Amino acid sequence: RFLKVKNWETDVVLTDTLHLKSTLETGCTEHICMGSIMLPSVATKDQLFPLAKEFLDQYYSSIKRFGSKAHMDRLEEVNKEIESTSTYQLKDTELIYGAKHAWRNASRCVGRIQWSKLQVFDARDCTTAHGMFNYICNHVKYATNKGNLRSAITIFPQRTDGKHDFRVWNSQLIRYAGYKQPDGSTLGDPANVQFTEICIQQGWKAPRGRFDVLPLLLQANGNDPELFQIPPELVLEVPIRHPKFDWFKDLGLKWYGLPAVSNMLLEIGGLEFSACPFSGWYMGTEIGVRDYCDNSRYNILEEVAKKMDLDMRKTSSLWKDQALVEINIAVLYSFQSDKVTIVDHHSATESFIKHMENEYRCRGGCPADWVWIVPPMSGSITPVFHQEMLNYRLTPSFEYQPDPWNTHVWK
Amino acid sequence: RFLKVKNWETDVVLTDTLHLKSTLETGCTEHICMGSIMLPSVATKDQLFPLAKEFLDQYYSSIKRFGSKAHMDRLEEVNKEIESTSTYQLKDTELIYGAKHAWRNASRCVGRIQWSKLQVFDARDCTTAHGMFNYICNHVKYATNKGNLRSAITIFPQRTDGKHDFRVWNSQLIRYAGYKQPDGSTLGDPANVQFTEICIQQGWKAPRGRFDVLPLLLQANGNDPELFQIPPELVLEVPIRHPKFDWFKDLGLKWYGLPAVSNMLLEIGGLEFSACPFSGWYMGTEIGVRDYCDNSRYNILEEVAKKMDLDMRKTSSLWKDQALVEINIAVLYSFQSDKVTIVDHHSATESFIKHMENEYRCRGGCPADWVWIVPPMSGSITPVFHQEMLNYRLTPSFEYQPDPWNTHVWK
Numbered sequence: 001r002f003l004k005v006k007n008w009e010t011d012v013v014l015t016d017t018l019h020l021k022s023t024l025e026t027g028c029t030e031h032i033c034m035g036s037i038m039l040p041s042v043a044t045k046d047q048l049f050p051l052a053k054e055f056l057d058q059y060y061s062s063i064k065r066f067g068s069k070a071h072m073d074r075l076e077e078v079n080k081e082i083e084s085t086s087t088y089q090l091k092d093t094e095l096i097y098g099a100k101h102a103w104r105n106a107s108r109c110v111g112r113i114q115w116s117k118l119q120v121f122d123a124r125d126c127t128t129a130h131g132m133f134n135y136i137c138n139h140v141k142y143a144t145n146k147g148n149l150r151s152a153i154t155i156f157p158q159r160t161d162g163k164h165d166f167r168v169w170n171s172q173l174i175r176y177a178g179y180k181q182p183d184g185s186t187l188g189d190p191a192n193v194q195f196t197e198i199c200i201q202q203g204w205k206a207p208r209g210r211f212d213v214l215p216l217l218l219q220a221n222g223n224d225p226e227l228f229q230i231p232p233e234l235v236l237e238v239p240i241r242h243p244k245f246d247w248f249k250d251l252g253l254k255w256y257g258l259p260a261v262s263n264m265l266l267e268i269g270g271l272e273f274s275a276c277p278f279s280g281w282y283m284g285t286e287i288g289v290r291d292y293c294d295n296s297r298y299n300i301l302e303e304v305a306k307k308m309d310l311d312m313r314k315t316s317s318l319w320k321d322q323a324l325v326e327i328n329i330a331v332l333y334s335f336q337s338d339k340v341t342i343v344d345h346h347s348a349t350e351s352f353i354k355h356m357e358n359e360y361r362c363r364g365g366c367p368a369d370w371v372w373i374v375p376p377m378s379g380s381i382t383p384v385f386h387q388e389m390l391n392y393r394l395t396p397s398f399e400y401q402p403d404p405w406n407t408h409v410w411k
Numbered sequence: 412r413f414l415k416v417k418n419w420e421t422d423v424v425l426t427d428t429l430h431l432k433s434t435l436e437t438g439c440t441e442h443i444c445m446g447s448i449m450l451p452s453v454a455t456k457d458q459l460f461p462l463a464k465e466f467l468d469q470y471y472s473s474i475k476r477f478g479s480k481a482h483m484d485r486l487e488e489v490n491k492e493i494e495s496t497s498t499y500q501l502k503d504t505e506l507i508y509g510a511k512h513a514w515r516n517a518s519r520c521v522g523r524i525q526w527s528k529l530q531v532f533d534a535r536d537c538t539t540a541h542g543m544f545n546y547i548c549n550h551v552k553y554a555t556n557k558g559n560l561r562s563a564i565t566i567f568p569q570r571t572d573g574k575h576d577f578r579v580w581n582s583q584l585i586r587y588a589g590y591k592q593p594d595g596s597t598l599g600d601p602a603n604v605q606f607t608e609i610c611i612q613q614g615w616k617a618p619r620g621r622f623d624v625l626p627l628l629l630q631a632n633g634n635d636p637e638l639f640q641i642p643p644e645l646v647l648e649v650p651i652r653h654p655k656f657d658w659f660k661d662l663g664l665k666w667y668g669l670p671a672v673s674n675m676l677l678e679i680g681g682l683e684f685s686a687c688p689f690s691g692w693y694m695g696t697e698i699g700v701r702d703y704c705d706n707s708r709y710n711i712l713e714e715v716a717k718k719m720d721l722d723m724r725k726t727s728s729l730w731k732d733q734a735l736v737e738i739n740i741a742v743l744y745s746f747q748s749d750k751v752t753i754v755d756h757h758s759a760t761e762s763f764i765k766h767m768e769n770e771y772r773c774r775g776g777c778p779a780d781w782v783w784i785v786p787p788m789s790g791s792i793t794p795v796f797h798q799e800m801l802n803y804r805l806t807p808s809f810e811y812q813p814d815p816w817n818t819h820v821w822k
């Protein structure tokens with residue numbers, strides 16, 4: 001009931017009591033653990049008020065005014081709004097608190113040490129696709145800060161009935177296109193081959209190359225979505241070069257600077273924000289391991305091994321491992337030499353351990369998903385590999401949601 | 412109730428129904444996932460018969476004779492033995508079946524594709540420490556097969572009352588010693604510093620070097636344990652050299668060929684075998700990542716980076732990642748050039764995926780612990796990283812047990 005997590009590299013123990021405030025369900029049972037399943041699985045006023053009260057009770061507890069008259073009046077004020085309107089509206093302060101704690105509670109995020117320095121852009125007055133584009137352009141420009149990347153979120157109107165949803169149909173604001181070929185192979189990013197098609201079905205004219213930035217597909221208030229091109233001056237890109245291998249430039253790789261997730265749902269006080277793009281900075285391995293070396297993404301270990309003059313016959317020559325490291329030295333060096341913010345999996349995992357220590361002290365724990373927190377290379381020479389972690393669902397939270405093209409009434 | 416696991420690199424889906432036969436508990440609840448906790452947590456005749464029947468019902472189902480007279484008579488025969496003796500004895504066939512399925516059911520083992528080719532040595536007639544030594548020497552000689560390693564297990568008498576336990580106090584039959592120093596640092600393997608002391612307290616005379624093979628501390632029938640030196644001709648070792656770097660020989664590293672776990676408990680039909688050493692062959696990363704590069708083990712990334720002429724100032728130069736790969740190319744090359752059996756994390760993880768496919772087809776699933784199955788380097792360029800896995804506890808099984816020095820009445 002008051003569980004213990006141990007670190008097996010330092011023999012450090014921490015006691016978790018925050019998991020008592022956990023609410024949602026994990027997918028695991030007493031007889032089965034699903035902690036490696038990727039996606040485990042209209043709101044009414046009956047459910048809304050307990051969720052609002054639970055959220056408000058922790059908000060007012062956070063500003064040192066638990067249960068005061070200002071608290072009780074806001075509780076009644078919201079209770080009466082849910083009675084009248086069958087929903088309610090967050091104060092700006094509550095919105096910023098809510099957003100910051102959805103990040104704080106993101107168990108799959110290794111970067112949460114930064115959770116309190118989030119810039120929240122309130123876009124709940126938006127009504128059109130064009131307004132979303134404008135709001136999203138300002139988000140991009142701010143978060144990029146000329147390479148001095150700053151974390152931020154832009155929050156579009158909450159879900160009302162269900163058929164009037166604000167949605168960014170892109171999974172990230174900046175992604176490269178994926179084109180299949182007549183010979184079956186893929187140009188660009190295979191991940192986005194389907195979304196790259198949908199843009200064309202809606203009228204996008206593709207430059208059909210490698211690193212072609214996709215347009216935005218913005219759906220406002222349930223209406224059919226619309227295409228907008230992000231001004232290229234707003235899309236910062238880093239060309240990937242190596243500090244030793246000069247042939248690495250001829251690989252002609254590059255990546256975008258701003259990681260900005262746009263397909264998730266923000267839950268605050270039982271209110272659902274279906275469009276809530278949020279951005280930080282990359283850990284190098286996201287690019288240099290997954291984006292570049294997944295078999296089903298850019299898949300470059302092939303060429304990189306070739307140019308290094310590697311034994312590619314035997315699997316046991318570790319030619320894949322050796323080329324994977326060079327690629328990540330180059331992603332980091334390129335970003336740093338350009339002064340674009342990035343963190344290596346060593347610094348980032350060390351910071352999460354120190355974050356964890358801060359959380360258990362001043363909060364009673366920190367939900368953490370080991371499967372996602374451990375980096376995709378060199379796992380056990382980073383400190384989080386040896387750190388036991390308890391995973392549980394706290395609110396406010398970011399949640400997955402269906403891709404909007406599978407659920408949307410059209411025209 | 413009939414769950415689905417997905418592979419996110421191949422889009423392959425498999426349906427798990429074997430988890431219905433799961434029995435023990437995982438430590439997880441509907442509200443908390445503990446799949447990253449390392450160790451989550453006298454038998455009477457009331458509990459023994461359901462466990463015996465459940466085991467016998469699956470044994471006789473495995474030889475195509477479910478519920479026959481030969482089955483029903485064995486059920487009654489065991490029921491009457493548990494009535495008379497408050498325990499029972501397995502047939503040799505049932506012992507071999509039991510042992511093979513404890514391996515098959517080992518969710519943290521990536522090598523299970525081999526589970527049916529296990530050599531089972533029945534040592535239930537053993538009565539003395541010296542007998543254990545003899546049985547264990549024959550196990551070592553057989554499993555090593557001059558480097559053509561063969562999987563095997565030796566099974567000492569089952570637990571009767573509790574104070575008459577057979578125990579191998581070593582955690583592995585072959586381990587290197589760990590000596591602290593006057594200046595605090597450690598010589599050899601820091602993992603075994605405590606056990607290396609216990610041997611001395613019992614009278615071991617240490618050659619106090621690096622790779623000094625520890626003696627065996629064998630406890631028979633509850634009596635105080637006794638020290639035996641494995642004949643050095645029986646302990647096969649590989650010196651670690653690199654196929655490119657000739658200075659790598661001067662590192663003077665070497666490792667033993669035979670991985671042989673001796674501190675776990677084998678459960679079959681509700682009977683507990685407290686001494687049951689079992690052995691296979693190494694995956695290279697067990698040596699070259701964990702044993703060699705854990706901060707709390709040999710910790711060699713220091714020197715290896717030095718001799719490679721690496722940028723060791725910045726963390727983001729990935730000098731640790733680069734040296735980690737070289738060390739694992741060398742472990743593999745050394746073992747192979749000596750014809751000592753070993754598997755690289757690529758071949759081994761590929762084989763486990765194909766094992767998984769075999770299991771789901773002919774068995775309805777395969778319990779698997781993602782946290783342990785993914786190798787400690789290059790995680791996502793191996794296929795198991797992208798494979799969802801369901802973890803659950805099947806019996807027969809290998810279980811953890813307390814270290815015997817913490818629990819043993821002495822003299």
Ligand code: HEM
Binds near residue numbers: 110111118152281
């Ligand atoms: C500022 C630096 C940040 C770093 C270094 C970082 C690091 C990471 C990494 C490596 C992942 C795993 C992504 C993947 O493997 O696909 C992740 C996931 C995640 N990030 Fe963070 N992140 C940062 C900022 C943020 C911010 C500002 C938010 C929200 C406001 C956020 C919310 C999340 C969530 C909810 C997930 C997991 C959900 C999912 O992606 O499936 N992150 N982060």
Ligand code: HEM
Binds near residue numbers: 517759809
């Ligand atoms: C034959 C080749 C084998 C390979 C390549 C292999 C591979 C592995 C690896 C890499 C681990 C993780 C160990 C660690 O990280 O400390 C492991 C664990 C395990 N192995 Fe296998 N193994 C093999 C044979 C066997 C055999 C013959 C048995 C039993 C009869 C067995 C039972 C287990 C169990 C029960 C565990 C997990 C329990 C624990 O170690 O905590 N293995 N194996």
Ligand SMILES: Cc1cc(N)nc(CCCN2CCN(C)CC2)c1
Binds near residue numbers: 260261278281283286
């Ligand atoms: C804000 C942010 C920062 C960062 N450094 N990285 C991310 C990546 C999140 C990937 N999610 C889940 C996987 N999904 C396939 C794509 C979306 C987000």
Ligand SMILES: Cc1cc(N)nc(CCCN2CCN(C)CC2)c1
Binds near residue numbers: 582689693694
């Ligand atoms: C039979 C076998 C083969 C193999 N290749 N590897 C192993 C290692 C098992 C490590 N276990 C758990 C961790 N524990 C600290 C030590 C004992 C066993």
Ligand SMILES: C[C@H](O)[C@H](O)[C@H]1CNc2nc(N)[nH]c(=O)c2N1
Binds near residue numbers: 387
């Ligand atoms: C904290 C975590 O449970 C612990 O470090 C685990 C992680 N995964 C592992 N996986 C394997 N194969 N072996 C281990 O010792 C561990 N250690």
Ligand SMILES: C[C@H](O)[C@H](O)[C@H]1CNc2nc(N)[nH]c(=O)c2N1
Binds near residue numbers: 419796798799
């Ligand atoms: C099967 C498994 O759930 C899946 O491949 C996960 C594993 N861990 C991950 N960890 C991170 N950070 N990102 C991912 O996409 C994944 N994928």
Ligand SMILES: [Zn+2]
Binds near residue numbers: 443
């Ligand atoms: Zn779990």
